[PDB]
Structure formats: structure tokens, C-alpha cells
Design a protein around this nucleic acid. Structure first.
Ligand SMILES: Nc1ncnc2c1ncn2[C@H]1C[C@H](O)[C@@H](COP(=O)(O)CP(=O)(O)OP(=O)(O)O)O1
Ligand SMILES: [Mn+2]
Ligand SMILES: [Mn+2]
Ligand SMILES: [Mn+2]
Ligand SMILES: [Mn+2]
Ligand code: NA
Ligand code: NA
Ligand code: NA
Ligand code: NA
Ligand code: NA
Length: 316
DNA sequence: CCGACGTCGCATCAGC
DNA sequence: GCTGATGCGA
DNA sequence: GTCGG
């Protein structure tokens, strides 16, 4: 809420560059600046103040000035009035419509949720589902419901095989009070770097059978993306939620939990002060080189001579 | 001045 | 019918 | 768009 006006402005610019301009490096530039400003412990009084911060340069400092003086950005006003820009931006809010599909839809006069309904025939399976749950997928998930969902996931996974280990990561694991979705990391001792054909399928199938998973967006041997829903009390239906399950080699569990706990910006940063310290971290391993042994998230921190950050202190 | 700035599993579908 | 090219969410 | 070459 502190430099919230500015970070909102920047995120909106980011989204425009990604969805309309298809300029992914400006999108990332804008998010990097929003992130460095969100972490700043002072109320920014000028663009020059922001300019001191890494990731904030000449053009963003100048936009910060306009915003502080005026309480708006003209270019964002100009964007939001443009019919093509605003329509493409809107449509990308549907899961399964990205910058390319949105643009093609808008080009052929399909620019609203009603137009999408009227044109279901031109939608693929993922986009029809994105449209069906358009509102639901934009609602956040209260931590209380994340706990209910957690217990159901871990429980049903155990019912398939007691040796599976399921871990809810993402914002949930960072201790957020609401989450955009549920991300589940799965492991099983039968699956490691060296050694599975139905390991994930068995878990998805069980979750469908107890009617927790309601839809499938994509599913392979290591990655499920779908829809789920907590069961209802006469009382009101819960909204449908996005759920991601990843099946990961047991011996890369800690690098995976680290990565899939995030945040995305944090992961970018840690990777930075690992490269600076003689290391390469990816979702699977830390290497100097062959993969160094790891027995905790802490270890990866130690390696790169960072003090351990709790999941909570990672939402950056 | 200017090149770097994430890579990937999974789904669809022109163009043969 | 097939698959290399492309798009999606991440 | 930004920053280090
Ligand atoms: N661009 C990126 N770079 C590095 N890591 C990335 C990443 N995008 C996602 N991740 C990783 C970390 C997320 O916490 C984790 C989940 O990705 P997610 O897309 O479900 C976003 P999350 O952090 O869970 O918050 P929320 O909005 O869902 O409540 O996957
Ligand atoms: Mn219409
Ligand atoms: Mn998430
Ligand atoms: Mn997710
Ligand atoms: Mn292929
Ligand atoms: Na200070
Ligand atoms: Na700067
Ligand atoms: Na989308
Ligand atoms: Na999301
Ligand atoms: Na420079």
C-alpha cells in the first residue's frame, strides 16, 4: 500500500507490454522495477529517488514523476481507451488465451466474454474451460480453503500409496493468507534421476474419482494442470480453483521445493547471487559441474553464502 | 552505442 | 494421417 | 526498459 500507486502503474505497463506489444523483455523490466520499489522502505517522493534503485532507469523515473504530480499516466490512459489494446488485454485474462490468440480473436471482431460464448466453436478445450470458470479463476483462495484442499490432496495421495510424498508449495507455502491457485509437488521413492508410467496418472485418477479434480487442461507423465473444487456442505458451491501438480525425482526434492515455493522474482534473484558466487541453480539441481549434494533448502542457501530465508520472507 | 534478459512439458493444427 | 512449428501457462 | 559491456 506504501508505493502502491506506482507499483500498480508499473504492473499495468508490464501487462500491456506482454499482452499487446508482445515485448517480454519490457514486461520483465517493468516487473523487476515494480518489485524493487515494492521492497523499498520509504515513500518515494520523486523519479530521481526511485532512479537510485536497480531496475529503475530513465523512462520509469520519468513516468514516476508524471504519476506523482498528476495521479495518472497519459500513456496508460491512451492505452485503456484504445479499442484493440484494451480488448487484447482483456481477452488474455481467459486461461488458454495468450497474446497471440487474443490478437487473432480481436482481429476477427471477437473482443468480449459474450463474443467468446457466441463463438465457442473457435475455442479449444483449454480455452472453453478458461471461459467457463472465468470469474472463479480470478477469485483468490482463502488460506482456510487451502488447508481444506491440502488435507484432501495429501489424504487421497496416501490412499494410492503410502510412500508418495505430496507437498503444497507456491504462495501457500510462503504462508500467504490467500493464494491464486494450489501447486502440488509430488515424489515417490520409485522415481529418481536414474530409474514412471502411471505414477502421476494414479494420483490424478484418484483425485478425479473422489470428484476433487473436475477438469483437465493438460496432463503428461510429470505435469498436471487442471481444475478442482472443494466439496459443498445445501450450503453454497465453492468456486472452482486452478491446481498444478508436478512429479519430481525424489533426489531433487529440495531444489524443487525451493523453486516451486518461489516467488518467481525471488527465484530470479537467488539465481543471481548464485551466479555471482560461483554456482548455477535451476528447478532441479545446484551445480558448481555435477549436481552438489543437497539435504535441505538451507543447504542451497549455505552453498551460495546467503543467510537462510524462511518461506515467508521470499514473496518478492 | 548495443546485446542480454528463462527454459519447458504439453496441446493443437497448417501444411504437407 | 502425420509432424514440425507455434502457442499456452509457467 | 535497464544495465553492464
Ligand atoms: N517466472 C518464474 N521463475 C521462477 N520460478 C517461477 C516462475 N513462475 C513460477 N515459478 C515458480 C515459483 C512459484 O512460487 C511457483 C508457483 O507458480 P504460480 O504460477 O502458481 C504463482 P504463486 O507464487 O504460487 O502465487 P499465487 O498467485 O499462485 O498465489 O512456481
Ligand atoms: Mn459483441
Ligand atoms: Mn500458485
Ligand atoms: Mn500454479
Ligand atoms: Mn512433434
Ligand atoms: Na533509507
Ligand atoms: Na537504477
Ligand atoms: Na490467458
Ligand atoms: Na495465477
Ligand atoms: Na550503463
Amino acid at each position: 500500500t506504501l508505493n502502491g500507486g506506482i507499483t500498480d502503474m508499473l504492473t499495468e505497463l508490464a501487462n500491456f507490454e506482454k499482452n499487446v506489444s508482445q515485448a517480454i523483455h519490457k514486461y520483465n523490466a517493468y516487473r523487476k522495477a515494480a518489485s524493487v520499489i515494492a521492497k523499498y522502505p520509504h515513500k518515494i517522493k520523486s523519479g530521481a529517488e526511485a532512479k537510485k534503485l536497480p531496475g529503475v532507469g530513465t523512462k520509469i523515473a520519468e513516468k514516476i514523476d508524471e504519476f506523482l504530480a498528476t495521479g495518472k499516466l497519459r500513456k496508460l490512459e491512451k492505452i485503456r481507451q484504445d479499442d484493440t489494446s484494451s480488448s487484447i488485454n482483456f481477452l488474455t485474462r481467459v486461461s488458454g488465451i495468450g497474446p497471440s490468440a487474443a490478437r487473432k480473436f480481436v482481429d476477427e471482431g471477437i473482443k468480449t466474454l459474450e463474443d467468446l460464448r457466441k463463438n465457442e466453436d473457435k475455442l479449444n478445450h483449454h480455452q472453453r474451460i478458461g471461459l467457463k470458470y472465468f470469474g472463479d479463476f480470478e477469485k483468490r483462495i482463502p488460506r482456510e480453503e487451502m488447508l481444506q484442499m491440502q488435507d484432501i490432496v495429501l489424504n487421497e495421495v496416501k490412499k494410492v500409496d503410502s510412500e508418495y510424498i505430496a507437498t503444497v508449495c507456491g504462495s501457500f507455502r510462503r504462508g500467504a493468507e490467500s493464494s491464486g491457485d494450489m501447486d502440488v509437488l509430488l515424489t515417490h521413492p520409485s522415481f529418481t534421476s536414474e530409474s514412471q508410467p502411471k505414477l502421476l496418472h494414479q494420483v490424478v485418477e484418484q483425485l478425479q474419482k473422489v470428484h476433487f479434480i473436475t477438469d483437465t487442461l493438460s496432463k503428461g507423465e510429470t505435469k498436471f494442470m487442471g481444475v478442482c473444487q472443494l466439496p459443498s456442505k445445501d450450503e453454497k458451491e465453492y468456486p472452482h480453483r486452478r491446481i498444478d501438480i508436478r512429479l519430481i525425482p525424489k533426489d531433487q526434492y529440495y531444489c524443487g521445493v525451493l523453486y516451486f515455493t518461489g516467488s518467481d522474482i525471488f527465484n530470479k534473484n537467488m539465481k543471481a547471487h548464485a551466479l555471482e558466487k560461483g554456482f548455477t541453480i535451476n528447478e532441479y539441481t545446484i551445480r558448481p559441474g555435477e549436481p552438489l549434494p543437497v539435504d535441505s533448502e538451507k543447504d542451497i542457501f549455505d552453498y551460495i553464502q546467503w543467510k537462510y530465508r524462511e518461506p515467508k520472507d521470499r514473496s518478492e
